[PDB]
């Protein structure tokens, strides 16, 4: 009972590309049927081949709300959208990600964490925005030297968003780099940042194999 993705790629499918609203997750499949750029808002999807290998055959697949939009993020605006992710002639964003911005001219220090109580592996995804100029780094995050730290029991990494004006893709001068990890049952993942964080909005718990 494999998967059928149609126009969407796994990058588009797993990130929640609004062009993929038709696709509903079924509990299991033996193998994925793609028709492969799926990244709505351009960027580098880290370990994309590694992720397609883990998602080849699954069981007990589930899509749950990991970080509620209207509570997990006090003192931060969460409704950040972009025209690169259009949805019926209107700007939108990934259906599984939140793009955190300033609130009242303030991006306070960030802290939040998730505990894997699903008793399965929880696939958690996030992104790192790489703006195109120093002016829009301050206007959205109020800090030139931003840091993002993702730490769990089995994965610890610290990102520094660098300001660089790349060639336009989807009519956008900046990128968002995508990253993921697997959270064991009973494990806790902790996000801390002060800017350029694309925090998880939903996540997937799954039995691999």
């Amino acid at each position: 009972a494999p998967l059928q993705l149609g126009n969407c790629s796994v990058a588009g499918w797993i990130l929640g590309n609004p062009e993929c609203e038709s696709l509903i997750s079924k509990e299991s499949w033996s193998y994925i049927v793609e028709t492969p750029n799926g990244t709505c808002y351009p960027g580098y999807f880290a370990d994309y081949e590694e992720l397609r290998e883990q998602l080849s055959s699954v069981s007990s697949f589930e899509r749950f709300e990991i970080f509620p939009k209207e509570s997990s993020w006090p003192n931060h605006t969460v409704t950040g959208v972009t025209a690169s992710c259009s949805h019926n002639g209107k700007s939108s964003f990934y259906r599984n990600l939140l793009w955190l911005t300033e609130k009242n001219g303030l991006y306070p220090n960030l802290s939040n964490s998730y505990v894997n109580n699903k008793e399965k592996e929880v696939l958690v995804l996030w992104g790192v925005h790489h703006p195109s100029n120093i002016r829009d780094q301050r206007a959205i995050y109020h800090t030139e030297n931003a840091y993002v730290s993702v730490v769990s029991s089995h994965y610890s990494r610290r990102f520094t968003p660098e300001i660089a004006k790349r060639p336009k893709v989807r009519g956008q001068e900046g990128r968002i780099n995508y990253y993921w990890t697997l959270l064991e049952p009973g494990d806790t993942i902790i996000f801390e940042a002060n800017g350029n964080l694309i925090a998880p909005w939903y996540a997937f718990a799954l039995s691999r194999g």
Epitope: P42, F159, E162, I163, P167, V169
Partner: antibody, heavy 122, light 114 residues
Framework: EVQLVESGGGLVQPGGSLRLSCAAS????????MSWVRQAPGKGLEWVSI???????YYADSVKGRFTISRDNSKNTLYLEMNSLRAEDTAVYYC????????????????WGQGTLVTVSG | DIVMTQSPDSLAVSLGERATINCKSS????????????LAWYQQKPGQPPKLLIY???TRESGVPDRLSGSGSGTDFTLTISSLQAEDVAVYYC?????????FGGGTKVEIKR
């Protein structure tokens, strides 16, 4: 095979306008990075402008709003229409190429033109 | 505006000696995604246009001799001529195609002692 033939330079009075051309053969200009790089006499190299992908354009802040880059695919040519030329614009302008692969990352200037000189004087 | 700085401003060594051209960038030329350094090295003989010798900091283009090589990763990069020949007398610019404005270095004039 891959050449770049430039033409359009010469003498122009301050405030005058002038149009530079770059004839190409060996690669499609609509499918690679095309850049202008001027070099003031006895001074270092300086980038000027680019055009790429769906005719998106970047410029340097020193010539922005005054120069306009463009291209013509049926003629396989690069253009740099210059307006409101100033004395410090007196430089040999070069034609530049880059292998636009995925269009995500930039590329260097692998193939160059032989250079034409624009003198801003009256 | 990444500031590309070269060292020295003029290099004169004997034929067959060993010459190094050092280029320090105002910012890291590496990408968090992969491990490729967007720095390029160009040659400009007198009266000629520039000629790309090295891209991706280390990789050479076709037709470029083996004695040329580019090293470095991050903010510090180096062009080196192991056995300097006679036809190598030219100016060498390091240039970043990291971000835009694309900026070259000041230039390094290499000369032969005889």
């Amino acid at each position: 095979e891959v050449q770049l033939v430039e033409s359009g330079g010469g003498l122009v009075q301050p405030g005058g306008s002038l149009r530079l051309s770059c004839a190409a053969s060996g690669f499609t200009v609509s499918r690679n990075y095309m850049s202008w790089v001027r070099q003031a006499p006895g001074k270092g190299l300086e980038w000027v402008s680019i055009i790429y992908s769906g005719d998106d354009t970047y410029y340097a802040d020193s010539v922005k709003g005054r120069f306009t880059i463009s291209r013509d695919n049926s003629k396989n040519t690069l253009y740099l229409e210059m307006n409101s030329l100033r004395a410090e614009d007196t430089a040999v302008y070069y034609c530049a190429r880059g292998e636009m692969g995925d269009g995500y990352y930039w590329a260097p200037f692998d193939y160059w033109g032989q250079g034409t000189l624009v003198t801003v004087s009256g | 505006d990444i500031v590309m700085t070269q060292s020295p401003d003029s290099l004169a060594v004997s034929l067959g000696e060993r010459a190094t051209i050092n280029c320090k960038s105002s910012q890291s030329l590496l990408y968090s995604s992969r491990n490729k350094n967007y720095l390029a090295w160009y040659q400009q003989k007198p009266g000629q246009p520039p000629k790309l010798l090295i891209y991706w900091a280390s990789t050479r283009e076709s037709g470029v001799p083996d004695r040329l090589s580019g090293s470095g990763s991050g903010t510090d990069f180096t062009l080196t001529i192991s056995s300097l020949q006679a036809e190598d007398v030219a100016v060498y610019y390091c240039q970043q195609y990291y971000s835009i404005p694309l900026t070259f270095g000041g230039g390094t004039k290499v000369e032969i002692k005889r």
